[PDB]
Design a protein around this ligand. Structure first.
Ligand SMILES: NC(=O)c1ccc[n+]([C@@H]2O[C@H](COP(=O)([O-])OP(=O)(O)OC[C@H]3O[C@@H](n4cnc5c(N)ncnc54)[C@H](O)[C@@H]3O)[C@@H](O)[C@H]2O)c1
Ligand SMILES: NC(=O)c1ccc[n+]([C@@H]2O[C@H](COP(=O)([O-])OP(=O)(O)OC[C@H]3O[C@@H](n4cnc5c(N)ncnc54)[C@H](O)[C@@H]3O)[C@@H](O)[C@H]2O)c1
Ligand SMILES: NC(=O)c1ccc[n+]([C@@H]2O[C@H](COP(=O)([O-])OP(=O)(O)OC[C@H]3O[C@@H](n4cnc5c(N)ncnc54)[C@H](O)[C@@H]3O)[C@@H](O)[C@H]2O)c1
Ligand SMILES: NC(=O)c1ccc[n+]([C@@H]2O[C@H](COP(=O)([O-])OP(=O)(O)OC[C@H]3O[C@@H](n4cnc5c(N)ncnc54)[C@H](O)[C@@H]3O)[C@@H](O)[C@H]2O)c1
Lengths: 344, 336, 336, 344
C-alpha cells in the first residue's frame, strides 16, 4: 500500500484534556424520565448540545438576578432583556412569554408591531391552525389571512378596529389637553391596561412595570388603524426619540444584563445596541433560524457582536439554530419554571 | 412547454446570451429569468404615458415628484448599503428609475459614512475579541474601523443642533423621511444615495431610524441639547399615500424584515401591488414574514391576485447587479 | 378548526402535557405534533395481526425476520451516528421496533469505532490547521482523535482476511448488507446498533459503503490480499423485495441524500409508502432531492396519494429523542 | 452624556494594513461591460466576494494544469476533480458540464446515479420547466414527475427502458463469457459509448478517457431497470471495490489536485476522501447551499476538511453559498472558457 497514503490516513493523535466530555445520547432502556432526557441533549451533539449550553447560560443569568442588592421599576442584580419577532406572538409562544411577564421574570421587552397587536387581538378572537401550502387566491376570496401555517380571519381585524378607535380618541385628547407626549412604550402600556385581560402579555407588562419597546410600531395593523383614525381625528404624534433614551438607560444603569433573543431583525439589533452603551451584555442566548452567509444582522453569529462591544469579550454567548416554537418552551421548562418559587 | 437547456459555451462567451439562458436552466436560474421579465414589465408600464383621466386621479398627491404610469418601491436591508450594492442603488436613484425607497437605519447612516471613510473587505471567521481590541467592527465579511463613527459624530452633531433649533424656532415637525432628505442635502456628495434621493424628490422611509449609529448620536446629543422629536405617524400617512394615488405599483424588495412588510403593507391600501420581485435568503418554515413566499402576501391583499410575483432565493449581492444590467441599465436612455 | 394556544406554565412543569401542546403551538411545533401522530399510526398498524390471506402474500419473502402488519424503514445520515442519536437508534433496533435500516458508510463504521474509542464534544469554530497538527478530526462540533481509526484498522484487517478467504474458498458473494451483518456479529457489543441488527435479522443497506474509513481500510487491504468484491445489485433486489411483499410500509427518514432517496425508491416499487415522516434541514429552492417536500415524492408514486406525510424542518439531534419518547417508548411493553 | 457609554461607542481604532481593499460595487454610469461587472463582484462583499475568490482559485488550478510536465489517461500538471449532484444534470448545468468534458478541461467526474441516467435520457426526450408549487396528486394522475421546478414525463423512462435493456443483455453476456468484472465507472463508459450523441456528457467522457465514479449507481432509475432486468436475465454483478481503487489512485499519483464540487453528499465526500490519500488537495472550490449547524458533511465548511487532511493546510479553499444553477455558468465564463485556446 502506498506509504504516503497510509501516513496521511493513519496519522498519530494527541490525547485530549481529561475534562473532555464524551458524546452519548439518552438511553431509553432507562424508561422515559423527561428531565433526564432533556439533560442528555448537552452530550448529544450539534444543536442539542447548543440547547444544553443555552440552559446553562439562562440558569446563570437567573441566579445572578436572584442575588440580593425615568423608570419606577426596581433594580435587581441582573436586568434581562427578552426580544421576539411578531410571528411568535401569532404562535402559541405567546403563552410562554405571557408566563414570564406575569411573574416578573424578565425586565424589558422588545418586539415588532405585529407582536404587540396580535396579543391584543387574541383576547378578542382566536387564531387557527392551517398549512403553509394553502393558496393565497382561495384564502383571499374567503376572507382569511395566512401567517405561516396559521390562519387569521379578516373579522379579527374588524373587532380590533371597533375596540381600538375610542382609545385612539382618548390618546389624542390627552395629548392636546394634558400634555402627554406619546411614544411606542407608553402606547403599549396604555393598550395593555385597556385590554384588561390576564391572557394578554401586555396587560401583565403594564401591571408589573415592564417596559415594551417597538420603534417601528406603525408597521402593522395598529399602523393601519392609526392611519384611518387620523383622517377622522387628526393630531396624534408618536415619538421614537424618548423611547431610545428609555431603553438605553435600562442598560446603562444595570448591574448586569442578559439578553434572550428569539428571532432576528430590529428586535435583535435594538437590544444588542442598547447593551453596547455599557460595553456589552454579560449573558446572551440567541434562538434563530437565520444564517451568516448573506452578511445580515439577523444571521450574524454572537461573535460578530463581540467585535462591536455588544457582548462582553469575557461572555460565553450561545446560539441555537432552530425554530423557537420548538425550543423556547423546553428552555423555559428547564430554567425559569424551575425557579418559580424564588420569583414570587 | 419550454425545454430545459443551458448556455452552450462552444458558442464563445457571449454574455447577453449567457444571461438570457438562465431562464431555461432551471431552479433559481429560472426564477432570475422570470424576475428580469417582471422588472422589464414594471419599466415598460412606467414609461407609458398617462391619459387625461389617469393624470387627474394621480396628481391628488401633493408630491413634487412627477407622476408616472407605475410607482416603483425599492426596499433594501442595512447590510446591502454596507456592501457594494450601495453603488447599484445610487445609480437607480440618480437616474430617477425608482420612486420610493425603504431601508433600515444602517442603510441610511452607512451611505453617509462611506462619503467620509471607506469600508474594507475581511472574512466571516475573524474573531471578535481580537477585532474589538483593535477597534475594528465586523459586518459579515466586511470591516468598519471605529474611527469611521468618530468622523460621523463630528459631521452630524452640528446638524442635530440646527434641527432642534428649527423645530423650536420655525415649528418644523421632524420625521425620519424629512431627516433623511436633510442629511442627503448636507452630505452634498454625488456618491451618496440620499444626496440623489433629495435632489430627485424620492422619499425615503425608515420607521425605526433610531436602531443604529444615528440613534447613538441622537441619544448622546439629547443630553446637551434636548427636545428632538421624530414622529413616525406622519411618515405612515406619506408612504400609504404614494400607493393609494398610484396608477400602478411595483415592488422590488431586497431582503426581509421591516423593509419588506412596510412596502407590502402600503400596497395593501390599494388592494395590492401589480408587480412584485423578492430577492432574499429567508425560508418559510419558521413562520416569519421575512421567509414568507409571495403567495402568503396574496392572501392578505398585499399583492394583487392576478399578479405574477417572483422570488429569487439568493444573496442579493450576487443577483441584484445582474438584474439591473438586464433591465434598468438597458433603458438608461429613456430615463435621461 | 383548532385554535392556537401554547402550554401554560402556571400549570407547573408537566412534561407530557408540555409535549402534547406542541401540536397547537404553530410552525414546526405543530409539524412535530403531526409527526408524533403519524408515527403512532405506523406503530398501531404494525401491531395489528395479519389475517390468513395477508399472512400468505407476505411470507413470499424468504426473510427470517417475522413479518408484521407494517414494515418500517428507518434512514439516517452518517453524522447522526457520530452524535448521541446513535443511542436512540440502537434502542429501536434492540427492541425490534424497526424492520429495515439505511445509512451511509459513516453511519456504519462510527458505531463500531464507538465500541473501541469515544467521540468528544468540541465546537464548530475550531481551526483545521491546529486540529490537524494534533491529529484531531472535526465532525461539526464533535471531535474524533485519529487514534480511533488506528484501533479500527487493527480490529478490522483480520476480518477482511477471513471475508476474502470465505469468498475464494466457500463461494460467499459479499454485499454491503452481508458485510454489515458480519461486522455487527464481530463487534459482539450490546452498545452497537449493528450487533442488535444482525441479532434481530434487521437488514442494513448502504450502497456506497466505500465512502469513508471502511473504504480506506478495504483499499489498503486490497494491496496485501486482493480480490474482495462488494456487489450492490443483489442488495437492490433485497431492499426492493422488503417493500413489494409488505402489507403496509412506513418511512422515518432523518436527513437527506442517498438514504432518503433509496428508501423512497424502494417504496415506489409498491406504488408508495402508506406513512412517511421526514426530519431534515434541507430546503427545496435548489432543486435537490434532500430538500424536496414530501409532496414532490407523491408526484413520483414514492408516497401514496392518500397518505398524510409530514416534514419537520429541524436538526434531528433535537427532535428525534422527543419523537421517540412520545411514540415507540410509550409502547415498549408491546415490543417485548 | 454618560462617560462609559461614550467610551464604549466612540472607541479608538487601529489603522488597517495598506494592502486593504475597499468595498465598492460596479458603477453603471460606465454603461454595461459584463466582464467589468463580473470582476466587480470581488469588491462587492458577502457571497459576491466569495465568487470573486472562487474565480481566482479556479484560474490558479487551470494555470498549474497548463504547465508542461490502471488508467490510459495522461498525467497533466494538475488533476481536476469535478463533482455534481444529480439534480444539476436535470437542470441546464448539464450543458455547462458537457462543455468542460468535451474539451478535456477536467480529469475525473463524480456524480450520483441520477446525474448519470438523466444525461442519457435527455438524448431521448426532453425535460420541461414547471414550478415548485405544483401538487403531487395532480401530476401523478397525468403521468408527470417533478424535480424541483422541472417536469419529466413518465414516457421518458419508458423510452430509456427500451434503449437500455439490450445493452444490459450484452453486459451480462460479456461478464459470463469474456470475463468482464463490471463496476460503475466501466458501465458508465459503456453507456456513454452506446448513446453515441455529442450532446451527452458521458459520450464525451468515454471519448476523452475521463473516468466517472458513482458508487451508489443503483439509487435511481438505472437501478430500477437493473432490478427488473435481473429477473429476465439474471447474473449481473456491479462491484464497487475496484472503483475505490481507481479513484484513489487518480489522487495518489497526481502532481497536483484541484476539486470543484457542486452540491454535497456522496459526491463531495468521495472526492475529498480520495484527496486525503495524498495528504490533501492543493485547490478547492465548493458551491453549495447547505449549512454547517446540523453537523452534516454536506454543510461542513472547507476548514473542517483541513482538520482531516482532505485539503492541504497551505491551501486557500473557497465556498460560495448559492444555487449552482446561478453561479456555475458565470464561474465557467470567467475561467475555463477564457482559456479555451490553450485546451485545444
Ligand atoms: N405576524 C407577522 O408576521 C406580522 C404581522 C404584522 C406585521 N408584521 C411586521 O413585519 C415586520 C417583519 O417582522 P419581524 O421583524 O418580526 O421579523 P420576521 O418574522 O420578518 O423575521 C426576522 C428573522 O427572524 C428569524 N425568525 C423568525 N421567526 C423565527 C422563529 N419562529 N424561530 C426562529 N427564528 C425566527 C428569521 O431568521 C427571520 O429571517 C415587522 O415590522 C412586523 O411588525 C408581521
Ligand atoms: N449594517 C447592518 O447590518 C446594520 C447597521 C446598523 C444597524 N442595523 C440594524 O439592524 C436591524 C436589522 O437589520 P435589517 O432589518 O436591515 O436586516 P437583517 O440584517 O435583519 O436581514 C433581514 C433578512 O433579510 C434577508 N437578507 C439580508 N441580507 C440579504 C442579502 N444579502 N441577500 C438576500 N437577502 C438578505 C435575510 O433573510 C435576513 O434574515 C435594523 O433595524 C438595522 O438598522 C444593522
Ligand atoms: N460522519 C460523517 O459525516 C461521515 C463520515 C464518513 C463518511 N461520510 C460520508 O459522507 C457522505 C455524505 O454524508 P451523508 O449522506 O450521510 O449526509 P450529509 O452529511 O451529506 O447530509 C445530507 C443532508 O441531510 C441533512 N441532515 C444532515 N444532518 C442532519 C441533522 N442533524 N438533522 C436533520 N437533517 C440533517 C441535511 O439537509 C444535509 O444536507 C456519505 O457517503 C458518508 O459515508 C460522512
Ligand atoms: N434528479 C434527482 O434529484 C434524482 C434522480 C434520481 C435519483 N436521485 C438520487 O437521489 C440521491 C440524493 O441526491 P444527491 O446525492 O445528488 O444530492 P441531493 O440533491 O439529494 O442534495 C445534496 C445536497 O447538495 C446541495 N445541493 C443540491 N443541489 C444544489 C444546487 N443546485 N446548488 C447548490 N447546492 C446544491 C444541497 O445542500 C443538498 O442538501 C442520489 O443517490 C441520487 O442518485 C435523485
Amino acid at each position: 500500500a502506498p506509504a504516503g497514503a497510509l501516513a496521511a490516513v493513519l496519522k498519530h493523535s494527541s490525547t485530549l484534556p481529561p475534562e473532555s466530555t464524551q458524546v452519548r445520547g439518552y438511553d431509553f432502556n432507562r424508561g422515559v424520565n423527561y428531565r433526564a432526557l432533556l439533560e442528555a441533549f448537552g452530550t448529544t451533539g450539534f444543536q442539542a448540545t447548543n440547547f444544553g449550553r443555552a440552559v446553562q447560560q439562562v440558569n446563570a443569568m437567573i441566579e445572578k438576578k436572584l442575588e440580593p442588592l425615568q423608570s419606577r421599576r426596581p433594580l435587581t442584580s441582573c436586568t434581562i432583556f427578552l426580544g421576539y419577532t411578531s410571528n411568535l406572538i401569532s404562535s402559541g409562544i405567546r403563552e410562554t412569554i405571557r408566563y414570564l411577564v406575569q411573574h416578573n421574570m424578565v425586565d424589558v421587552l422588545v418586539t415588532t408591531a405585529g407582536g404587540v397587536e396580535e396579543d391584543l387581538i387574541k383576547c378578542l378572537a382566536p387564531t387557527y391552525l392551517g398549512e403553509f401550502s394553502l393558496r393565497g387566491k382561495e384564502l383571499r376570496e374567503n376572507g382569511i389571512n395566512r401567517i405561516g401555517n396559521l390562519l387569521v380571519p379578516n373579522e379579527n381585524y374588524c373587532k380590533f378596529e371597533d375596540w381600538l378607535m375610542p382609545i385612539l380618541d382618548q390618546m389624542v385628547m390627552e395629548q392636546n389637553t394634558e400634555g402627554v407626549k406619546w411614544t411606542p412604550s407608553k402606547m403599549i402600556a396604555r393598550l395593555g391596561k385597556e385590554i384588561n385581560n390576564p391572557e394578554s402579555v401586555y396587560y401583565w407588562a403594564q401591571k408589573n412595570h415592564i417596559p415594551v419597546f417597538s420603534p417601528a410600531l406603525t408597521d402593522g395593523s395598529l399602523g393601519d388603524m392609526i392611519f384611518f383614525h387620523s383622517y377622522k381625528n387628526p393630531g396624534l404624534v408618536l415619538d421614537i426619540v424618548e423611547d431610545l433614551r428609555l431603553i438605553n438607560t435600562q442598560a446603562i444603569f444595570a448591574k448586569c444584563t442578559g439578553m434572550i433573543i428569539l428571532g432576528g431583525g430590529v428586535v435583535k439589533h435594538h437590544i444588542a445596541n442598547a447593551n453596547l452603551m455599557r460595553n456589552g451584555a454579560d449573558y446572551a442566548v440567541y434562538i434563530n433560524t437565520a444564517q451568516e452567509f448573506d452578511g445580515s444582522d439577523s444571521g450574524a453569529r454572537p461573535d460578530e457582536a463581540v467585535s462591536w462591544g455588544x457582548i462582553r469579550v469575557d461572555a460565553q454567548p450561545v446560539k441555537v439554530y432552530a425554530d423557537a416554537s420548538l425550543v423556547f418552551p423546553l428552555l423555559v421548562a428547564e430554567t425559569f419554571a424551575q425557579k418559580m418559587d424564588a420569583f414570587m
